[PDB]
């Protein structure tokens, strides 16, 4: 009576634990991947992150400048 009224079967806890373990394992591998990606991006600078600003080339004046040799 106690088992029927207050508790459930072992399969419920078993599968819940499996789902939780899978979720946490994916989270851990994602954290490692994010750390590695951050390290590589900061070391190289070829990714969208750590793109420090540079001088815009649209500000340059392309016209004769009173002197042929610029």
């Amino acid at each position: 009576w106690i088992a029927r009224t207050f508790y459930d079967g072992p399969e419920k806890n078993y599968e819940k634990t499996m789902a939780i373990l899978q979720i946490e394992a994916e989270k851990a591998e994602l954290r490692l991947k994010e750390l590695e990606v951050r390290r590589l991006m900061r070391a190289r600078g070829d990714g969208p992150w750590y793109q420090y600003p540079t001088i815009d080339k649209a500000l340059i004046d392309h016209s004769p400048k009173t002197t042929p040799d610029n």
């Binding site: 078993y14 634990t17 499996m18 373990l21 899978q22 946490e24 394992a25």
Partner: peptide
Amino acid sequence: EKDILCMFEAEM
């Protein structure tokens, strides 16, 4: 090596 589900089943 890192199969969490199979490791869990084997442990139980």
